[PDB]
Amino acid sequence: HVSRNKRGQVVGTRGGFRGCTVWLTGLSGAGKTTVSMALEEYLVCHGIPCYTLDGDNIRQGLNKNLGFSPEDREENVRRIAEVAKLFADAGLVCITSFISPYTQDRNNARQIHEGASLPFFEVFVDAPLHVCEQRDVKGLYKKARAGEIKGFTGIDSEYEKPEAPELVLKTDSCDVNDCVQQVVELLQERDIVPVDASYEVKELYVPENKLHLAKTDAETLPALKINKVDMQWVQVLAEGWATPLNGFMREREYLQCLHFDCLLDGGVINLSVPIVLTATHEDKERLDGCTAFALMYEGRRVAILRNPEFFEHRKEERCARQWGTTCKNHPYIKMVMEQGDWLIGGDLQVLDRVYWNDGLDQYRLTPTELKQKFKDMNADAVSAFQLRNPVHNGHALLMQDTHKQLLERGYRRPVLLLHPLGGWTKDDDVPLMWRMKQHAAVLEEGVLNPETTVVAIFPSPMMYAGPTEVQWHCRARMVAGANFYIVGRDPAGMPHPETGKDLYEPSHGAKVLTMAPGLITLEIVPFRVAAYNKKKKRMDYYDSEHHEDFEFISGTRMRKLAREGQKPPEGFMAPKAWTVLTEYYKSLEK
Amino acid sequence: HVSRNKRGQVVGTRGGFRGCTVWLTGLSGAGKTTVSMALEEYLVCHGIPCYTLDGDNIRQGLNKNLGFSPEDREENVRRIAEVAKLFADAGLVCITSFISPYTQDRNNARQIHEGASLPFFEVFVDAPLEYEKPEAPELVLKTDSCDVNDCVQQVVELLQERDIVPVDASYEVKELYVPENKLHLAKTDAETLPALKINKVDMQWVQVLAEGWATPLNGFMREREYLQCLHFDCLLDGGVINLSVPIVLTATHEDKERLDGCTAFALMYEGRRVAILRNPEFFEHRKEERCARQWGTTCKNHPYIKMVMEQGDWLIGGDLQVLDRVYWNDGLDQYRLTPTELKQKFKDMNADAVSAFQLRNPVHNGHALLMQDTHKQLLERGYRRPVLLLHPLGGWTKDDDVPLMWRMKQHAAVLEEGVLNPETTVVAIFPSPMMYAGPTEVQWHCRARMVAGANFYIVGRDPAGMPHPETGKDLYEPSHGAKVLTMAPGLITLEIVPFRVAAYNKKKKRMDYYDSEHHEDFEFISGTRMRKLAREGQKPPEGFMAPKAWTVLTEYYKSLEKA
Ligand SMILES: Nc1ncnc2c1ncn2[C@@H]1O[C@H](COP(=O)(O)OP(=O)(O)O)[C@@H](O)[C@H]1O
Ligand SMILES: Nc1ncnc2c1ncn2[C@@H]1O[C@H](COP(=O)(O)OP(=O)(O)O)[C@@H](O)[C@H]1O
Ligand SMILES: Nc1ncnc2c1ncn2[C@@H]1O[C@H](COP(=O)(O)OP(=O)(O)O)[C@@H](O)[C@H]1O
């Protein structure tokens, strides 16, 4: 015969043998039918073939010749157990749904399974006899109280409670979802049902109560000195923004990311940018072989990377695939080109909590802290606005028009996550402190409402990789609990350093995002280019037949106006936000 | 309870509900046992969950309390039939192997099935020597007089007829040829249309498309498809399927402007109208980005990138209706099988597994080793008639590669020498241009073969690579092709069979897998070294290449030298 290992490559789409028997037992009306039906449905919605033995298929086929007097009752269970073991042998999750009141009959069913190395999960669907009588789902209790059913178990027979059930379901204190979840978690604990890849936040910080230990432990390890952009990726990871990574990407994750823009093990997860740690040939030969090493920023041990692996940093290829150009003078590519030729993946345990002592640590909320913030505000929708530039009223418009659309849909407490990036940025961008003072100003003028707006800083470095990057911007906000992701023209783009043309076609980030896999809990809210409209004296959506009506105001014109001592047109930006920028531009010329 | 249709979607890996019972009956123990065991292996080898009820799992279990009384035996057969019913209900092919001598009982078993709307196939294993021969069995297996595999084939054919086993569950090929009954009208209509001249590489991609290798594209990629392809290596709309290379048509600004607005236009190659492209859309090429994402470099001297860089700034997608059957009239057309002709070929040869070997170079015995070991692997896993699709690429190749005609002559010599077995090998030309994009292109090599019905796809070292024209180092990391392919999405109906690098073992005098400890037992002979050796009138070591095949290459290199 074909082995269990091989029958399981072909039973279902999920690999690996998982035949077993989930043996429900309890009083008439305790919940067995209802649990097995909901379990079966879960299993089938998750790709795991199963089959249920119950009163409707056993009693009138195989067991039709069995009456009620007690040797028949014993034989009934025995036959059910033998059939179930056969189903389990065949690679199915067999669910059985019979009162099965006697301990001896159920231990026998367990032993027929265990003697054949098939898992047997005895699930006691436990509700008091009075409750099951109350329910009297099929009117059998009312018919027993007045004769003409037998030793109806609970009344004229006994029900013998299992002594060591794999699970007890207290159906008078829990709901059907509680039941199904408790059973599914059992089956996951026991490797019958796999744990799919998830976006549920996963911090890589060691628990506070394990901290001091981990620090001591970190002291005994060899060490690798990291730089500030790295430390900032250490924070992206620590806080969960790259959930479910367990650390810097291993080879297999890096290659998935570069070719498919997704992690694929255990389900499709969007992750389009490498999150890697680099190393020179010298650091590799030093650390290669150790099972753990510490990462050291500004002479402090900030994280431990366990079970590391070293693989090549094929830099030209990485760059080409991530940015769609290998141009040496792209400012993030320039840094990648100066890194080592090795990458290191492993499981990252981050130690002290990351704080930059710079005056802005109050805005650097983790995804958990943000989710908590959204619930504390009782939002029923969260829209996110990634950005790296001062907010002008073209951005504000996209935020204002999304807030509108969510009102018109029915939401009654939309919250805006105004989410500037604070990780590394290229030289000629507006420094983070400036931009935050600038958005504070925009909020003080009420262009965005401070009572419905959370302002926090996204710790990722900025890569300037367009349609590749904007998936990362988007997914990061989905992790933090955004339900809606606002995207306009050329997101994450910049001019090509050699040609001066746009590196990326401006509609690409949005088109790509609207069809990118793994972006399941959010909706993409895309917008056309907005620009100062000179006729209507406000920011508006650009229109082609009407070219003369619109002023495009670049970071470069603004810097010019600020020197000349002038102002952009009224309604381009909030006057106090402008003032912040004049103060910015003043220090810049020095 | 979840319905049959829904249980049918999760039970196995092929989709469609196919619960039924194959009820063997007859005296011969070995006949029943050999048939059930082999049918079981076949079903599992082909992705169909099944389960056998026989003495070894019923007698001492479910029926352990039944003996030989006429009543016990009847009950014995009743219980097995009800259980079989439950497996068939669960979506499995249930095979039961019991003498079941009595018409009454077999007939009852059938009614338990037929009354629950489950197919029941009574198979009389008839091997003459109060058994009651079935009056109208679905099948008669003469097991004493036909071998096991023909018997199993008989059952499998019956299951195909009755829609349990798929006649064919490769990905359905979508040709883009206009059907032979509409061609004349379609060529007349093409005559009325504007025209866009295309070159020969284009006309090869027209062929890729026509013949269905890029299923489910309906023609040259529209923007959406191009973006999915470059970012995700897959088409996504209505299902994820692997497609990692752009399949596109380029155009100049001048041709875009002439043609933008037209709802259809003809493609013209050597003065002939070869295709119509309908409802075209024009979008920006973006050559540097395309090149970077597709090849992992923008190096201007990579020989396909160099062609992409001389094409126009526009791409044109649309619905492609290919007219005349593409034929090249160079003497190799007999090998240019479409995916539909290949599937039919594999049927005619009664394959029960197809292993594909993509290549673009002369076959040496390292390549052969991969094929031979694959063939071993398939036999060991239960396949009885594995067929090798030897599938040289025949579209554009770079300047110093061995020309296609010489390669086909070389491979005919390899098969003439028995290094691969001509009787279990189909030799056909894959019509794609070769891009030399390594791990990106290897997915395209693999998906193309999937559409042609390959069940297993062999991949080795540095598939689809080449030296970086600047450094001469490998453009791609040499393990990446395999690693990426083994995990690539959208290639669900075949299996990847990856191999480590093979090389000439001096000690053993044969091609073998390389070993780091043993570095110096291994000679690596490149195409370069082959050419040098020919020029000085030497041969490679014995066992590296079939002799007749080497001789073809000397003829090739000789014709170079005349040049
Ligand atoms: N958490 C629970 N799990 C299962 N059933 C529950 C639960 N809470 C209430 N019930 C109800 O209890 C009754 C159980 O009936 P049923 O499943 O047929 O019991 P059994 O099959 O054990 O005779 C149903 O009406 C069901 O909705
Ligand atoms: N003026 C514009 N009109 C429409 N959308 C815009 C405009 N300017 C910026 N956007 C969009 O607003 C956000 C702009 O943020 P911006 O700070 O430059 O940084 P980035 O796009 O790098 O994240 C993105 O969604 C981007 O597409
Ligand atoms: N010496 C070798 N050892 C192992 N695999 C090899 C070897 N040479 C080539 N291969 C593999 O053999 C197949 C054919 O190689 P080749 O004809 O050179 O073309 P390409 O790899 O472009 O398809 C590919 O799977 C390739 O990885």
Short mmCIF file of C-alpha atoms in Angstrom, two decimals, chain A residues 136-328:
data_model
loop_
_atom_site.label_atom_id
_atom_site.label_comp_id
_atom_site.label_asym_id
_atom_site.label_seq_id
_atom_site.Cartn_x
_atom_site.Cartn_y
_atom_site.Cartn_z
CA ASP A 136 -34.31 20.10 24.19
CA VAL A 137 -33.29 20.60 20.55
CA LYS A 138 -35.16 17.61 19.13
CA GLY A 139 -37.73 17.16 21.90
CA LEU A 140 -36.03 13.93 23.09
CA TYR A 141 -35.75 14.97 26.78
CA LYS A 142 -39.60 15.65 27.08
CA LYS A 143 -40.24 12.26 25.53
CA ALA A 144 -37.88 10.55 27.99
CA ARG A 145 -39.41 12.24 31.08
CA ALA A 146 -42.75 10.66 30.15
CA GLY A 147 -41.45 7.37 28.80
CA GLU A 148 -40.83 5.95 25.78
CA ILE A 149 -37.13 6.34 25.47
CA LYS A 150 -34.98 3.76 27.13
CA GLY A 151 -32.05 4.69 29.32
CA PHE A 152 -31.80 8.05 27.53
CA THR A 153 -28.35 8.99 28.70
CA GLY A 154 -28.46 11.61 31.52
CA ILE A 155 -31.92 10.48 32.66
CA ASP A 156 -32.24 6.66 32.82
CA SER A 157 -28.59 5.93 31.70
CA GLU A 158 -25.39 7.46 32.93
CA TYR A 159 -23.03 9.75 31.19
CA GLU A 160 -19.46 9.14 32.39
CA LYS A 161 -17.40 12.31 31.98
CA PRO A 162 -13.98 11.89 30.38
CA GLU A 163 -11.13 12.00 32.96
CA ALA A 164 -8.34 13.23 30.58
CA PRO A 165 -9.99 14.84 27.54
CA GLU A 166 -7.73 16.69 25.18
CA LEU A 167 -10.25 19.47 25.40
CA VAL A 168 -13.28 20.50 27.36
CA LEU A 169 -15.90 22.81 25.65
CA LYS A 170 -18.08 24.55 28.19
CA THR A 171 -20.96 25.30 25.83
CA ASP A 172 -23.07 27.12 28.48
CA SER A 173 -20.34 29.63 29.05
CA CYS A 174 -18.99 30.11 25.50
CA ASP A 175 -20.22 30.47 21.94
CA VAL A 176 -19.85 28.46 18.81
CA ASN A 177 -16.83 30.56 17.73
CA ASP A 178 -15.27 29.88 21.13
CA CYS A 179 -15.75 26.17 20.51
CA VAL A 180 -14.36 26.17 17.04
CA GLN A 181 -11.42 28.26 18.04
CA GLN A 182 -10.55 26.07 21.00
CA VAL A 183 -10.67 22.97 18.75
CA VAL A 184 -8.73 24.59 15.93
CA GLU A 185 -6.03 25.80 18.38
CA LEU A 186 -5.75 22.25 19.71
CA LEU A 187 -5.29 20.95 16.23
CA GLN A 188 -2.71 23.63 15.48
CA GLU A 189 -0.80 22.88 18.73
CA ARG A 190 -0.83 19.18 17.53
CA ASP A 191 0.28 19.88 13.94
CA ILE A 192 -2.87 18.86 12.20
CA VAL A 193 -3.91 22.31 11.09
CA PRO A 194 -1.03 24.57 10.01
CA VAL A 195 -0.54 28.09 11.34
CA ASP A 196 -0.81 30.37 8.24
CA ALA A 197 1.34 33.40 7.79
CA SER A 198 -0.42 36.41 9.46
CA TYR A 199 -0.18 40.20 9.70
CA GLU A 200 -0.97 40.13 13.43
CA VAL A 201 1.66 42.45 14.91
CA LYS A 202 4.80 40.71 15.86
CA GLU A 203 7.29 42.70 17.88
CA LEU A 204 10.72 41.51 18.05
CA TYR A 205 11.53 43.24 21.40
CA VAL A 206 12.39 40.87 24.29
CA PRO A 207 9.81 41.16 27.04
CA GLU A 208 10.76 43.89 29.70
CA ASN A 209 10.98 41.21 32.39
CA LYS A 210 13.51 39.24 30.26
CA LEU A 211 15.40 42.37 29.30
CA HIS A 212 18.17 42.54 31.92
CA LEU A 213 18.95 38.85 31.36
CA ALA A 214 19.10 39.26 27.62
CA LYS A 215 21.52 42.17 28.13
CA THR A 216 23.77 40.08 30.33
CA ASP A 217 23.49 37.29 27.77
CA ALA A 218 24.33 39.93 25.02
CA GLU A 219 27.51 40.82 26.80
CA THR A 220 29.01 37.37 26.39
CA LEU A 221 28.56 37.45 22.49
CA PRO A 222 30.76 38.55 19.67
CA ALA A 223 29.54 41.84 18.27
CA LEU A 224 28.81 43.63 15.08
CA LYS A 225 28.86 47.31 14.83
CA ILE A 226 25.96 48.78 12.95
CA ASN A 227 25.24 52.31 11.65
CA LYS A 228 22.26 54.53 12.02
CA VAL A 229 20.25 53.47 8.96
CA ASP A 230 20.64 49.88 10.19
CA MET A 231 19.55 50.86 13.69
CA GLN A 232 16.47 52.41 12.13
CA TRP A 233 15.69 49.10 10.24
CA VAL A 234 16.30 47.47 13.68
CA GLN A 235 13.43 49.55 14.76
CA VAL A 236 11.17 48.82 11.92
CA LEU A 237 11.67 45.22 12.83
CA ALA A 238 11.49 45.60 16.66
CA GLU A 239 8.13 47.21 16.44
CA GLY A 240 6.50 44.83 14.07
CA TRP A 241 6.15 46.96 10.92
CA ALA A 242 7.66 44.03 8.91
CA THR A 243 5.47 41.46 10.55
CA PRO A 244 5.82 38.47 10.32
CA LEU A 245 9.49 38.59 9.81
CA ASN A 246 11.38 37.05 12.73
CA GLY A 247 14.51 39.14 11.97
CA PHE A 248 16.64 40.39 9.10
CA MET A 249 15.58 38.35 5.96
CA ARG A 250 17.16 35.03 5.37
CA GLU A 251 18.14 34.10 1.79
CA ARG A 252 14.94 32.40 1.01
CA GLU A 253 12.95 35.49 2.21
CA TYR A 254 15.24 37.92 0.42
CA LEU A 255 14.82 36.06 -2.89
CA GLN A 256 11.05 35.91 -2.54
CA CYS A 257 11.00 39.51 -1.80
CA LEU A 258 13.16 40.56 -4.79
CA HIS A 259 11.45 38.35 -7.37
CA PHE A 260 7.83 38.27 -6.16
CA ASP A 261 7.44 41.22 -3.81
CA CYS A 262 5.89 38.81 -1.31
CA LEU A 263 6.88 36.35 1.39
CA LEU A 264 5.29 33.08 0.47
CA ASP A 265 5.94 30.51 3.23
CA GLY A 266 2.65 29.68 4.98
CA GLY A 267 0.66 32.16 2.81
CA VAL A 268 1.12 35.20 0.68
CA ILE A 269 2.41 38.21 2.59
CA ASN A 270 3.26 41.49 0.79
CA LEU A 271 6.85 42.59 1.51
CA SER A 272 8.51 44.26 -1.33
CA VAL A 273 11.71 45.68 0.07
CA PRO A 274 14.58 43.77 1.37
CA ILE A 275 15.10 44.11 5.27
CA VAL A 276 18.50 42.95 5.50
CA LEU A 277 21.69 43.42 7.46
CA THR A 278 24.92 43.71 5.55
CA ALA A 279 28.49 42.71 6.40
CA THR A 280 31.94 42.82 4.78
CA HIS A 281 34.01 39.74 3.85
CA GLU A 282 35.94 40.40 7.17
CA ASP A 283 32.85 40.47 9.41
CA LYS A 284 31.50 37.41 7.71
CA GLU A 285 34.58 35.34 8.35
CA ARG A 286 34.70 36.49 11.89
CA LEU A 287 31.00 35.74 12.72
CA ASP A 288 30.30 32.83 10.38
CA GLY A 289 29.99 29.87 12.70
CA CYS A 290 28.68 31.66 15.76
CA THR A 291 25.08 30.91 16.81
CA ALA A 292 24.42 34.37 18.08
CA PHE A 293 25.90 37.79 17.98
CA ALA A 294 25.07 41.18 19.28
CA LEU A 295 24.46 44.27 17.33
CA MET A 296 26.18 47.39 18.64
CA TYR A 297 25.02 50.90 17.85
CA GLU A 298 27.06 53.85 19.51
CA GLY A 299 28.88 51.33 21.57
CA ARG A 300 25.67 49.80 23.10
CA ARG A 301 24.56 46.16 22.54
CA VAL A 302 21.05 46.86 21.06
CA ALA A 303 19.98 43.41 19.76
CA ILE A 304 21.01 39.87 19.45
CA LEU A 305 20.77 38.02 16.06
CA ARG A 306 20.44 34.32 16.62
CA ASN A 307 20.94 31.45 14.18
CA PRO A 308 22.42 33.73 11.59
CA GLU A 309 22.95 32.92 7.89
CA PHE A 310 25.28 34.57 5.46
CA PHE A 311 24.51 34.97 1.81
CA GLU A 312 25.64 37.10 -0.97
CA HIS A 313 24.68 40.66 -1.43
CA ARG A 314 24.59 40.73 -5.17
CA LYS A 315 24.37 44.45 -5.18
CA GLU A 316 23.91 45.32 -8.78
CA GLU A 317 21.13 42.77 -9.13
CA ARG A 318 19.42 43.81 -5.91
CA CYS A 319 19.45 47.37 -6.94
CA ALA A 320 18.19 46.68 -10.45
CA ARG A 321 15.27 44.62 -9.11
CA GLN A 322 14.33 46.93 -6.21
CA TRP A 323 14.69 50.26 -7.86
CA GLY A 324 14.45 49.38 -11.51
CA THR A 325 17.78 51.21 -12.20
CA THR A 326 21.40 50.60 -10.98
CA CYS A 327 22.29 54.28 -11.15
CA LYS A 328 25.26 54.81 -8.72
#
